[PDB]
Amino acid sequence: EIIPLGRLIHMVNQKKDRLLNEYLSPLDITAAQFKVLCSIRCAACITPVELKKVLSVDLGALTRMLDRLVSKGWVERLPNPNDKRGVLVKLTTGGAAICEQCHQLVGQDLHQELTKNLTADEVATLEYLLKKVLP
Amino acid sequence: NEIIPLGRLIHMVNQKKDRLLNEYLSPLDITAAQFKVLCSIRCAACITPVELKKVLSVDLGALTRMLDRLVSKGWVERLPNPNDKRGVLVKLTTGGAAICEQCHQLVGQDLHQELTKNLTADEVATLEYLLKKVLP
Numbered sequence: 342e343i344i345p346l347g348r349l350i351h352m353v354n355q356k357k358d359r360l361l362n363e364y365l366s367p368l369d370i371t372a373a374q375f376k377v378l379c380s381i382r383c384a385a386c387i388t389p390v391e392l393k394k395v396l397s398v399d400l401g402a403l404t405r406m407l408d409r410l411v412s413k414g415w416v417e418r419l420p421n422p423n424d425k426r427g428v429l430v431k432l433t434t435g436g437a438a439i440c441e442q443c444h445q446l447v448g449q450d451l452h453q454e455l456t457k458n459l460t461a462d463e464v465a466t467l468e469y470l471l472k473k474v475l476p
Numbered sequence: 477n478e479i480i481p482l483g484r485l486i487h488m489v490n491q492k493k494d495r496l497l498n499e500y501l502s503p504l505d506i507t508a509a510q511f512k513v514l515c516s517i518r519c520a521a522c523i524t525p526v527e528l529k530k531v532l533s534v535d536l537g538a539l540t541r542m543l544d545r546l547v548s549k550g551w552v553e554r555l556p557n558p559n560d561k562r563g564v565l566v567k568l569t570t571g572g573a574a575i576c577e578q579c580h581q582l583v584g585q586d587l588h589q590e591l592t593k594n595l596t597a598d599e600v601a602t603l604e605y606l607l608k609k610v611l612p
Binding site: 342344345346347349350351352353354356357358361397399401402448451452455456458459463464466467468470471472473474475476 | 479482494495509535587600603607608612
């Protein structure tokens, strides 16, 4: 069973997303919708284009999603002080709160599920070596 | 040197992988999304757009357009579904099969080399071993 690193990372990622959808279920929010809120939360404000690059998802589907999240009262559109034709999406008070709830609900359990087949010893090594791939 | 949880680490390393994938694919005029499609169609010999939307977790709108683009390129052909008549079965052409293989070769080596740049071979071995453990 030799499997290349690239594909293993993909598979483990997909599994993480399955579990994300599961653990986010009580808050009626998908993993895709959640990743959006987080990305917007990391930058005070961000444009749909800039958000498309960070997330690596289709612009059309993302624009529909951005409008879903506006109806939910989680995301608002400020006009860009720079562009005035593009908009800056940011989180609402409700969005920021819902996003933090999502973190509080998902965080510990997802990690605990992903790492059930591993020792805390092996967990440390895995985190360490994944860190080495990043810079 | 800060404790980043496994969940977020996998996202960052995956996102890095996807970006490097787009790089090593520009020279052949085919996008990363287009490439994933061909691979999924390759793996299941024949597949419904519906069934393919599920495997890629993409938008059916974007996929139908992306399928149209790949039909233009002559990499993907539509057969009528013998089981349905309202659906189609997309599959790869010889051309599309060649290109999919050629992309897997062109990026198969280099993506790996680039990802494992800062890693010993023993560390890479250890890394793959522990990732596999997360999958059952």
